[PDB]
Design a protein around this motif. Structure first.
Motif, PDB file in Angstrom:
ATOM      1  N   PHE A  70       1.237  17.733  12.400  1.00 42.38           N
ATOM      2  CA  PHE A  70       1.159  16.628  13.237  1.00 42.38           C
ATOM      3  C   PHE A  70      -0.461  15.887  11.984  1.00 42.38           C
ATOM      4  N   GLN A  71      -0.191  14.822  11.651  1.00 40.97           N
ATOM      5  CA  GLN A  71      -0.878  14.248  10.442  1.00 40.97           C
ATOM      6  C   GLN A  71      -1.555  13.393  11.093  1.00 40.97           C
ATOM      7  N   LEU A  72      -3.106  12.803  11.066  1.00 44.29           N
ATOM      8  CA  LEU A  72      -2.833  11.536  10.957  1.00 44.29           C
ATOM      9  C   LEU A  72      -4.508  10.957  10.194  1.00 44.29           C
ATOM     10  N   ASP A  73      -5.072   9.828  10.058  1.00 39.50           N
ATOM     11  CA  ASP A  73      -5.998   9.215   9.132  1.00 39.50           C
ATOM     12  C   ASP A  73      -6.806   8.760   9.918  1.00 39.50           C
ATOM     13  N   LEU A 115      15.133  18.488  12.058  1.00 44.14           N
ATOM     14  CA  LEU A 115      14.260  18.084  13.046  1.00 44.14           C
ATOM     15  C   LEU A 115      13.882  17.752  14.234  1.00 44.14           C
ATOM     16  N   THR A 132      -9.215   7.168   9.119  1.00 50.69           N
ATOM     17  CA  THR A 132      -9.765   6.157   9.273  1.00 50.69           C
ATOM     18  C   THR A 132      -9.209   4.924  10.113  1.00 50.69           C
ATOM     19  N   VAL A 189       1.102   9.193   0.385  1.00 51.27           N
ATOM     20  CA  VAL A 189       2.106  10.168   0.140  1.00 51.27           C
ATOM     21  C   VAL A 189       1.718  10.770   1.231  1.00 51.27           C
ATOM     22  N   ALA A 190       3.306  11.451   2.027  1.00 52.43           N
ATOM     23  CA  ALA A 190       2.500  11.435   3.330  1.00 52.43           C
ATOM     24  C   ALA A 190       3.734  12.688   3.658  1.00 52.43           C
ATOM     25  N   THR A 191       3.187  13.829   4.377  1.00 55.09           N
ATOM     26  CA  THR A 191       3.740  15.252   3.968  1.00 55.09           C
ATOM     27  C   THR A 191       4.322  15.113   5.790  1.00 55.09           C
ATOM     28  N   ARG A 218       1.495  -1.213   0.013  1.00 53.80           N
ATOM     29  CA  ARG A 218      -0.008   0.348   0.275  1.00 53.80           C
ATOM     30  C   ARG A 218       1.049   0.879   0.330  1.00 53.80           C
ATOM     31  N   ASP A 228       7.243  14.222   8.832  1.00 56.99           N
ATOM     32  CA  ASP A 228       7.869  13.529   9.629  1.00 56.99           C
ATOM     33  C   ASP A 228       7.430  12.159   9.696  1.00 56.99           C
ATOM     34  N   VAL A 229       6.043  12.183  10.044  1.00 51.25           N
ATOM     35  CA  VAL A 229       5.551  11.113  10.508  1.00 51.25           C
ATOM     36  C   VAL A 229       3.934  10.986   9.917  1.00 51.25           C
ATOM     37  N   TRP A 230       3.200   9.642   9.757  1.00 50.43           N
ATOM     38  CA  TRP A 230       2.325   9.209   9.332  1.00 50.43           C
ATOM     39  C   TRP A 230       1.868   8.421  10.612  1.00 50.43           C
ATOM     40  N   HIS A 231       0.652   9.205  10.914  1.00 49.31           N
ATOM     41  CA  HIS A 231      -0.244   8.224  12.507  1.00 49.31           C
ATOM     42  C   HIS A 231      -1.473   8.256  11.818  1.00 49.31           C
ATOM     43  N   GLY A 232      -2.199   6.705  12.289  1.00 53.32           N
ATOM     44  CA  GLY A 232      -3.264   6.310  12.423  1.00 53.32           C
ATOM     45  C   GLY A 232      -3.684   5.694  13.545  1.00 53.32           C
TER      46      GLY A 232
END
Lengths: 47, 47
Positions: free
Chosen positions: B14-17, B3, B19, A39-41, A36, A43-47
């Motif tokens: 800060f970013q979050l998904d 960073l 779902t 695209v990330a914006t 899968r 430094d980190v990507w959270h879910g």
């Protein structure tokens, strides 16, 4: 008077093929076909 | 100025998904396609 460099041998042309020959094994993975991609914006990507 | 948090890393959004990923086995039973289904109205079904 033969093919030695001094005895007339300087008269022969020099023949070279410009194309390079890659001698690296490389690697073949198909993970990117099944995984899968998101695209990330930043430094980190959270879910 | 990289960073790390104390050297300008406090500005990255800060970013979050939102779902929600289900980490549950589930259970796919297939009785309901074969069994006989009757609609009850009281408490006990007789025949």
């Amino acid at each position: 008077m033969g093919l030695t460099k001094a005895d007339g041998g300087y008269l022969v042309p020099f023949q070279l093929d410009p194309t390079v020959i890659i001698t690296s094994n490389g690697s073949l993975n198909d993970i990117r076909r099944f995984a899968r991609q998101v695209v990330a914006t930043g430094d980190v990507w959270h879910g």
